[PDB]
Amino acid sequence: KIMEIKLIKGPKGLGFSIAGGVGNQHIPGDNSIYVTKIIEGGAAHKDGKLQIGDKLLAVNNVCLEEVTHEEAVTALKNTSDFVYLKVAKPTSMY
Amino acid sequence: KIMEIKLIKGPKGLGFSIAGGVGNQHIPGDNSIYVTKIIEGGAAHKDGKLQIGDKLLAVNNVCLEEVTHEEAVTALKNTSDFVYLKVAKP
Amino acid sequence: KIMEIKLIKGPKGLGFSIAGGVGNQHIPGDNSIYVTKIIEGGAAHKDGKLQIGDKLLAVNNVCLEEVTHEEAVTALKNTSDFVYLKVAKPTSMYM
Amino acid sequence: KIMEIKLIKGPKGLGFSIAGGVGNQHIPGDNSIYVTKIIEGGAAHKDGKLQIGDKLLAVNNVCLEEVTHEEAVTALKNTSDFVYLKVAKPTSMY
Amino acid sequence: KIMEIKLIKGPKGLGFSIAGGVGNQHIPGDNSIYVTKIIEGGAAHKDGKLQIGDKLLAVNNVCLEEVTHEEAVTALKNTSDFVYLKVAKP
Amino acid sequence: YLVTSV
């Protein structure tokens, strides 16, 4: 379920796209922020750990649960160069 | 976009399924109520006008824009035999 | 026409295989993702709607149009047990 | 039931003939395109997978279900060197 | 001179082996990628055109001249099933 | 083992 990903921000930024947010539900009934694209060459790609479908819970102690999409975009844009991403990975039964 | 569908509730009811609503978005960013299924034999089917993908705007002029799923279900089942559906066609 | 399929994973996942993607065309001149195999007794098979050769449009609202094969595999694997597939369905012009 | 076939076109083309279509039913009440001949020594023949009585479902990403004979022919002659076909295999000689 | 060989990749791949590359010369002085084996029963065998000793110039618009062994291997494996080879015969 | 096959 939970993993912690540490990134050094690239000159292009963190190099990933997000969807989700309150009133912008990526999955019906779910307000969470999800990773939808990892951009080639970017910080998240080079590190190799973040994946499409990952849910973002926090960036640097700023909570991403039950926020709007616009808030999430602002919280991610507005970090320093050293980034701690708390993420939840989907799990199965098997 | 908007057309009116008048229906007479069958023994089985209106005979279509709905998804959507505030807090249960069928399409991201969209709160509307959408028809997801037309049940064979049922009144909606026999009439023919309602299609999977139609957005329900109202029932008996009870407004279905910006409501919860449960409110939409409640509205639909509290109808009489005669039903006036306001729908938007994509 | 777009068909939505809801699958619940079994012990062996969703029970289908895919081909395609940018740089890995399944059909010439087309980067799209396609179902190539549906495994006997698996979740896709038991639901009954998905077919070999179906173009996948999105999984859990992640768009599978103009993505690489690796992106599509991850988008399908990195999911919970409840998966929403959007699939393109051909319809008749009548003529 | 459904088979995917990938072919390289020969100097003479795909090396099969078709019948059927809307307005041109090969079988009463059925508008589908049917393979009626595999040309000896042609591309379909050498590949081995296509067979007489196969229902054509698509050529490349052109759907061939409920098209006219003219639309199927056009779409089949409209191919370059590499060709994808999608077919339904018959259940009975009939 | 140059020959074009078109192949449909099988479940086992193209069915040939290669040697050569920058840093791994098959012939002293020569960085080219060469076919060293045609695999019994494979797609290259069935087609019949590709032969041992053939120099590979390109695969699907990817240049194979003055590349490393690893680059050539990666270009030959990361292709779609539709394989176009440009080849120089001795 | 020594052969690189594609």
Residue numbers in the entry:
A (entry chain D), D (entry chain A): 316 to 409
B (entry chain E), E (entry chain B): 316 to 405
C (entry chain C): 316 to 410
F (entry chain F): 2838 to 2843
Q: What did the article's authors report about this structure?
A:
The human Discs Large 1/Synapse Associated Protein 97 (here referred to as DLG1) protein is a member of the membrane-associated guanylate kinase (MAGUK) family, a protein family that has been identified at sites of cell-cell contacts in different organisms including humans. The human tumor suppressor Adenomatous Polyposis Coli (APC) is a 2,843-residue protein. The second PDZ domain of DLG1 (residues 315–410, referred to as PDZ2 hereafter) has been reported to bind to APC, while neither the first PDZ domain (residues 220–310, PDZ1) nor the third PDZ domain (residues 462–550, PDZ3) of DLG1 has been reported to show substantial APC-binding activity. In addition, we determined the crystal structure of the PDZ1 domain in complex with the C-terminal 11 residues of APC (APC-C11) as well as the crystal structure of the PDZ2 domain in complex with APC-C11.
In the crystal structure of the PDZ2/APC-C11 complex, four PDZ2 monomers and one PDZ2/APC-C11 heterodimer can be found in each asymmetry unit. Despite considerable effort, only one APC peptide molecule (residues 2838–2843) could be located in complex with PDZ2. There was no interpretable electron density for the APC peptide near the other four PDZ2 molecules in the asymmetric unit. Compared to the PDZ1/APC complex, the interaction between PDZ2 and APC seems to be weaker because of the low occupancy of APC molecules. We speculate that it is due to the low affinity between PDZ2 and APC-C11 under our crystallization condition. Although we did not observe these non-canonical interactions in the PDZ2/APC-C11 complex structure, it is possible that the crystallization condition we used for producing crystals of the PDZ2/APC-C11 complex was not favorable for these interactions. Although similar movement of the β2/β3 loop was not observed in our PDZ2/APC-C11 complex structure, we suspect that it is because the crystallization condition we used was not favorable for this conformational change. In the structure of the PDZ2/APC-C11 complex, the β1/β2 loop moves slightly away from the α2 helix, whereas this movement of the β1/β2 loop is not observed in the PDZ1/APC-C11 complex. This movement may be a result of crystal packing, since similar movement can also be found in the free PDZ2 molecules in the same asymmetry unit. Although we did not observe the interaction between the β2/β3 loop of PDZ2 and APC-C11 in our structure, our GST pull-down and ITC assay results support that this interaction is critical for PDZ2/APC binding.
